[PDB]
Amino acid sequence: SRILAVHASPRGERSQSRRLAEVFLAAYREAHPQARVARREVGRVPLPAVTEAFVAAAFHPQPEQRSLAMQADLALSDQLVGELFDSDLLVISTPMYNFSVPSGLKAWIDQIVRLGVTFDFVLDNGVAQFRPLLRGKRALIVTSRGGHGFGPGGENQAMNHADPWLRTALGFIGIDEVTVVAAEGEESFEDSCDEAEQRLLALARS
Amino acid sequence: SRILAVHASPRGERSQSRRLAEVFLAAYREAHPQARVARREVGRVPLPAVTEAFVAAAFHPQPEQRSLAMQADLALSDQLVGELFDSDLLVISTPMYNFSVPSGLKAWIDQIVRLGVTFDFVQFRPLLRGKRALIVTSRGGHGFGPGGENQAMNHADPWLRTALGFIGIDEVTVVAAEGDEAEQRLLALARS
Numbered sequence A: 001s002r003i004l005a006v007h008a009s010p011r012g013e014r015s016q017s018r019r020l021a022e023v024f025l026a027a028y029r030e031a032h033p034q035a036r037v038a039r040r041e042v043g044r045v046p047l048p049a050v051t052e053a054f055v056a057a058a059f060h061p062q063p064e065q066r067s068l069a070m071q072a073d074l075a076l077s078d079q080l081v082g083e084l085f086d087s088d089l090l091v092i093s094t095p096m097y098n099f100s101v102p103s104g105l106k107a108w109i110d111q112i113v114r115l116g117v118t119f120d121f122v123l124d125n126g127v128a129q130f131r132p133l134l135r136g137k138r139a140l141i142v143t144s145r146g147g148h149g150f151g152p153g154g155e156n157q158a159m160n161h162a163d164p165w166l167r168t169a170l171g172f173i174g175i176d177e178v179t180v181v182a183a184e185g186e187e188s189f190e191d192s193c194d195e196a197e198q199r200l201l202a203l204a205r206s
Numbered sequence B: 001s002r003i004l005a006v007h008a009s010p011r012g013e014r015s016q017s018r019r020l021a022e023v024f025l026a027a028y029r030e031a032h033p034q035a036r037v038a039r040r041e042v043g044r045v046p047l048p049a050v051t052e053a054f055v056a057a058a059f060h061p062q063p064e065q066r067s068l069a070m071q072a073d074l075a076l077s078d079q080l081v082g083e084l085f086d087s088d089l090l091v092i093s094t095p096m097y098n099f100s101v102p103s104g105l106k107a108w109i110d111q112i113v114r115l116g117v118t119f120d121f122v123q124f125r126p127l128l129r130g131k132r133a134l135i136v137t138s139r140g141g142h143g144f145g146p147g148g149e150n151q152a153m154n155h156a157d158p159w160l161r162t163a164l165g166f167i168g169i170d171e172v173t174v175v176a177a178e179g180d181e182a183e184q185r186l187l188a189l190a191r192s
């Protein structure tokens, strides 16, 4: 299984979501030395937001008629989508920032949801029926939160617009086998982190 | 009232959410001739994402000791927060991008939720009071609103409610254009 690891925390050595994901990646590497791991940084590195030029190009009615300028507008996106297509397992590490994800990860999503590439649609009696184009891929979301109760059955579950939103977006392009490993209370914390780590080691084994 | 208008669409003239929000602002200006409007562009212009440097400064345990470099990391944030403090009514226009908001608006939120400034902790508590918000959003599809078929997929304006609520803005109205009803709804709102 070829892996694409997308890291979304701006923090490096101190990122818990990054560290936990790397725990999973190393463990996996251990069991599968031939396996390819690609890393895509969207936290410590800026990722362009969708511009009007991007929209005009990505939804151009006749795509092969895009100008060289237009293609250039889509070049990063093409690269980012290519990484996804080349992967069987997508691993996203992300903090919860203000009840969602860091803006860099939102930008990454916005680049890789592409008409005619990762999703499609068809016009049925006026309204669009959409169709995902990604097949045979899985996703693991490793997330870290400062507070508690954002998981299932949690007191604050309805406030969680981070990993549940990621599920929705990923599912839209065809990735609906998604596992979320969460550590809470990074400010019981060493416990939550230790549990996430054991969970990730088990997931890596299999 | 003093109004802060935050525009999140990357599109200019073609932006339906921008257009609708400006219909409201012009109408509101007519019912209140000495109103002041401040516009903050977060769609057509890049907003820096939160960096590790931002985190270290913003959550500094002794903020009065911040170095000049740290204050520089928070300079834009202070400006954005100031615009919010100086406003009575916040108007946010935004598209739904992949079941959330454009990344620029996420970045705006990440700049203006600030420890000791728009929220504090002892239990977190909001520090913004006396403000209202109007969210003008447009979507390509249908059924993302209340009682809607796809309401559970909507992490755009419902998420905005959560984040705004955290800092104290809990009087929020959403006007959505899916698929001239929105326009008329907004004209009526501007009259009150």
Ligand SMILES: Cc1cc2nc3c(=O)[nH]c(=O)nc-3n(C[C@H](O)[C@H](O)[C@H](O)COP(=O)(O)O)c2cc1C
Pocket (backbone or CB within 6 Å): A009, A010, A011, A014, A015, A016, A017, A018, A094, A095, A096, A097, A098, A099, A100, A144, A145, A146, A147, A148, A186, A187, B050, B055, B110
């Ligand atoms: C800008 C910012 C926003 C945050 N928002 C939340 C939040 O909404 N809910 C929460 O539980 N923790 C929040 N936190 C705390 C982080 O979720 C927590 O520190 C997390 O572990 C950061 O991920 P990282 O360790 O990979 O950098 C926030 C932290 C920052 C810097």
Ligand SMILES: Cc1cc2nc3c(=O)[nH]c(=O)nc-3n(C[C@H](O)[C@H](O)[C@H](O)COP(=O)(O)O)c2cc1C
Pocket (backbone or CB within 6 Å): A050, A055, A110, B009, B010, B011, B014, B015, B016, B017, B018, B094, B095, B096, B097, B098, B099, B100, B138, B139, B140, B141, B142
């Ligand atoms: C990158 C991108 C993502 C979009 N995602 C969604 C979506 O998830 N759901 C939806 O109903 N429409 C979606 N749309 C359609 C837009 O929501 C629609 O065109 C909207 O009116 C854009 O706002 P604006 O006119 O102010 O630019 C998307 C459009 C773009 C360009």
Ligand SMILES: CN(C)c1ccc(/N=N/c2ccccc2C(=O)O)cc1
Pocket (backbone or CB within 6 Å): A098, A146, A147, A148, A149, A156, A187, B113, B124
């Ligand atoms: C358990 N409840 C109700 C919570 C707990 C934590 C929370 N946000 N945390 C944060 C929010 C913004 C910035 C930094 C943090 C941070 O470092 O924690 C929101 C709601």
Ligand SMILES: CN(C)c1ccc(/N=N/c2ccccc2C(=O)O)cc1
Pocket (backbone or CB within 6 Å): A113, A130, B097, B098, B140, B141, B142, B143, B150, B153
């Ligand atoms: C009927 N349901 C649930 C829907 C309707 C529309 C929809 N996404 N639209 C989009 C999604 C991503 C990118 C661009 C569009 C766009 O231009 O519309 C998703 C789900």
